[PDB]
Design an enzyme around this catalytic site. Structure first.
Site, PDB file in Angstrom:
ATOM      1  N   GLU A   1       0.948  -1.174  -0.087  1.00  0.00           N
ATOM      2  CA  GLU A   1      -0.080  -0.135   0.018  1.00  0.00           C
ATOM      3  C   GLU A   1       0.750   1.284  -0.242  1.00  0.00           C
ATOM      4  OE1 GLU A   1      -2.316  -0.030   3.628  1.00  0.00           O
ATOM      5  OE2 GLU A   1      -3.236   1.905   2.849  1.00  0.00           O
TER       6      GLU A   1
ATOM      7  N   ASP B   1       0.262   4.882   0.822  1.00  0.00           N
ATOM      8  CA  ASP B   1      -0.512   5.827   1.359  1.00  0.00           C
ATOM      9  C   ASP B   1      -0.253   7.331   0.857  1.00  0.00           C
ATOM     10  OD1 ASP B   1      -2.562   4.248   2.519  1.00  0.00           O
ATOM     11  OD2 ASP B   1      -1.168   3.727   4.050  1.00  0.00           O
TER      12      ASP B   1
ATOM     13  N   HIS C   1       3.878   1.098   2.667  1.00  0.00           N
ATOM     14  CA  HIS C   1       3.785   0.095   3.608  1.00  0.00           C
ATOM     15  C   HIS C   1       3.871  -0.976   2.562  1.00  0.00           C
ATOM     16  CE1 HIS C   1       1.158   1.763   6.949  1.00  0.00           C
ATOM     17  NE2 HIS C   1       0.867   2.577   5.941  1.00  0.00           N
TER      18      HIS C   1
END
Ligand SMILES: OC[C@H]1O[C@@H](O[C@H]2[C@H](O)[C@@H](O)[C@H](O[C@H]3[C@H](O)[C@@H](O)[C@H](O[C@H]4[C@H](O)[C@@H](O)[C@H](O[C@H]5[C@H](O)[C@@H](O)[C@H](O)O[C@@H]5CO)O[C@@H]4CO)O[C@@H]3CO)O[C@@H]2CO)[C@H](O)[C@@H](O)[C@@H]1O
Ligand SMILES: *[C@@H]1O[C@H](CO)[C@@H](O[C@@H]2O[C@H](CO)[C@@H](O[C@@H]3O[C@H](CO)[C@@H](O)[C@H](O)[C@@H]3O)[C@H](O)[C@H]2NC(C)=O)[C@H](O)[C@H]1NC(C)=O
Ligand SMILES: OC[C@H]1O[C@@H](O[C@H]2[C@H](O)[C@@H](O)[C@H](O[C@H]3[C@H](O)[C@@H](O)[C@H](O)O[C@@H]3CO)O[C@@H]2CO)[C@H](O)[C@@H](O)[C@@H]1O
Ligand SMILES: *[C@@H]1O[C@H](CO)[C@@H](O[C@@H]2O[C@H](CO)[C@@H](O)[C@H](O)[C@H]2NC(C)=O)[C@H](O)[C@H]1NC(C)=O
Length: 436
Positions: free
Chosen positions: A209, A211, A225
């Protein structure tokens, strides 16, 4: 999950731009789709719910497979039920609509296929209005390594697909999803104590991910991540790790990330109401994913941020944390930040930027969402966290909100008309989306 027929599905349109050089962009006619978890799930041969509140009905769902065969995801009344509207390049997500709280949407290439972005050696820009996001809310815009088809080619019992928002995954290995990999999540389902609509099952859905943006009018963070496997994978039980397993560090993904929140990094003057980036008005957020050799096949090496407001291009502020220099995310920065804050370096453990970049190579789906936080009240974003620590200790203070803030029942009652609006998405080569 089957594709239901009881409520019509129509994806709100959303334009965005591809740029080849500054001022040289062309328009893409995209659309968005609501995540499957928000939808009515019912008997494929009728209208009886398979899931109500946070309970599965054993008549239809005696096991995960039978449930997926017997139950359909149905269509979404975007505006009237979910508070989602669009116009041109703008997407507005309202907070409370009836009993519904927020939303999570994916950008579509076509009615059955998520748009894939290859972020390496590219730049992504968008405009946002966070002025109506108080303590405890998070308007997020981010990328996850979902399958473009929502899982349908791999999982025959998923007939709903991207058209109905299937296939979500993220670095929390979420176990709250009702369908994962063509199976329901009934067999080990445990209803949430504090959320009448949710629970946690034995299956979770993991993937890396990026973000880009998690924010409200108080604070923002940018956080990669990594996961051991970059793309979507299923996990089981507490080995999933993530926010809702017994041990958030037990699994294959980094649940914490390597974050840059300018307030947490020691500049409280930079971002917020009336600040250098004034959150009472809209602004532009630019993010660059640089590689070690500056080419498309280099290894992800640096994530940079610029803001534009009132036509002023403003770089991310430098860290003012002792031992942690610069204004960008790099391996050196991440190692230093974890050391300075005394936080476990789970980012490094799961391959850091190298594994983040591996996920970027697989292609990622754009997610836009608005949520409140039953686990931690968004205190990690906008308050002092953990709450037992001294707020003067580096790493603890992340925004101005008090530690009593952000309880869902409070903010849903007090700020139902909150919203986030994303607009003017642009994507292309480095320096192509703004005036460098
Ligand atoms: O009347 C129509 C129809 O309603 C059916 O009931 C629906 C109802 O309409 C929906 O409002 C409701 O929606 C909730 C979902 O059940 C629930 O799973 C979802 O949970 C969210 C959670 O609230 C949120 O905090 C979490 O946020 C994530 C972000 O989205 C990510 O961006 C971030 O990275 O991570 C956070 C934390 O995980 O996401 C989860 C979902 O994964 O909240 C929904 C909104 O309140 O769903 C009902 C069905 O369960 C009804 O059954 C039908 O009979 C009826 O026809
Ligand atoms: C919080 O972050 C802001 C934004 O980065 C900091 O403001 C910035 O401070 C730098 C360094 O002093 C300024 O750069 C300098 O500008 C002068 C004049 O143009 C120039 O002579 C120098 O060579 C250098 O470029 C920058 O202008 C300024 N940015 C903005 C938008 O105000 C601020 O200092 C930080 N606050 C704290 C308390 O750490
Ligand atoms: O969106 C997924 C889930 O997120 C949870 O928020 C977590 C953040 O995503 C994560 O970046 C942050 O990591 C913290 C870490 O917990 C803390 O120990 C360290 O000092 O700082 C890190 C950076 O802020 O953790 C939070 C909390 O787990 C939401 O709470 C959850 O609802 C949501 O599903
Ligand atoms: C994107 O534009 C930036 C800003 O113009 C370029 O970075 C500058 O690069 C020169 C050297 O080539 C440096 O002297 C400046 O200090 C840099 N400025 C900043 C703000 O970093 C950058 O090279 C451009 N990127 C590409 C791929 O062309």
């Amino acid at each position: 999950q089957q594709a239901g027929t009881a409520t019509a599905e129509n994806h709100p349109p959303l334009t965005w731009q591809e740029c080849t050089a500054p001022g040289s962009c062309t328009t893409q006619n995209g659309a968005v789709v609501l995540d499957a978890n928000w939808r009515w799930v019912h008997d494929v041969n009728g209208y009886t719910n398979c899931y109500t509140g946070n309970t599965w009905d054993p008549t239809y769902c005696p096991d995960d497979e039978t449930c997926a065969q017997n139950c359909a995801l149905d269509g979404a009344d975007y505006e009237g039920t979910y508070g989602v509207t669009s116009s041109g390049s703008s997407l507005k997500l309202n907070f409370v609509t009836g009993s519904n709280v927020g939303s999570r949407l994916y950008l579509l290439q076509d009615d059955s296929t998520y748009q894939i972005f290859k972020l390496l050696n590219r730049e992504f820009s968008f405009d946002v209005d966070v002025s109506n996001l108080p303590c405890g809310l998070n308007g997020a815009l981010y990328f996850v390594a979902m399958d473009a088809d929502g899982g349908v080619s791999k999982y025959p019992n998923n007939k709903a697909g991207a058209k109905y928002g299937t296939g979500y995954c993220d670095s929390q290995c979420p176990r709250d999803l009702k369908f994962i990999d063509g199976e329901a999540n009934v067999e080990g389902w445990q209803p949430s104590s504090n959320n009448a609509n949710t629970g946690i099952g034995d299956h979770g859905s993991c993937c890396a991910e990026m973000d880009v943006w998690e924010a409200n009018s108080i604070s923002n963070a940018v956080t990669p991540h990594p996961c051991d496997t970059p793309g979507q994978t299923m996990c089981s039980g507490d080995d999933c790790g993530g926010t809702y397993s017994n041990d958030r560090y037990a699994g294959t993904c980094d649940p914490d990330g390597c974050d840059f929140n300018p307030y947490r990094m020691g500049n409280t003057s930079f971002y917020g109401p009336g600040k250098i980036i004034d959150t009472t008005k809209p602004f532009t957020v630019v993010t660059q994913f640089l590689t070690d050799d500056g080419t498309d096949t280099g290894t992800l090496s640096e994530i940079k941020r610029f803001y534009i407001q009132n036509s002023n291009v403003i770089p991310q502020p430098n860290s003012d944390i002792s031992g942690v220099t610069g204004n960008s995310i790099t391996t050196e920065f991440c190692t230093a930040q974890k050391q300075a804050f005394g936080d476990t370096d789970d980012f490094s453990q799961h391959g850091g930027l190298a594994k983040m970049g591996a996920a970027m190579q697989q292609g990622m789906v754009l997610v836009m969402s608005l949520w409140d936080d039953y686990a931690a009240q968004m205190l990690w974003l906008d308050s002092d966290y953990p709450t037992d620590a001294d707020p003067t200790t580096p790493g603890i203070a992340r925004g101005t909100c008090p530690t009593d803030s952000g309880v869902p029942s409070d903010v849903e009652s007090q700020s139902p008309n909150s919203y986030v609006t994303y607009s003017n998405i642009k994507f292309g080569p480095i320096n192509s989306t703004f005036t460098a």
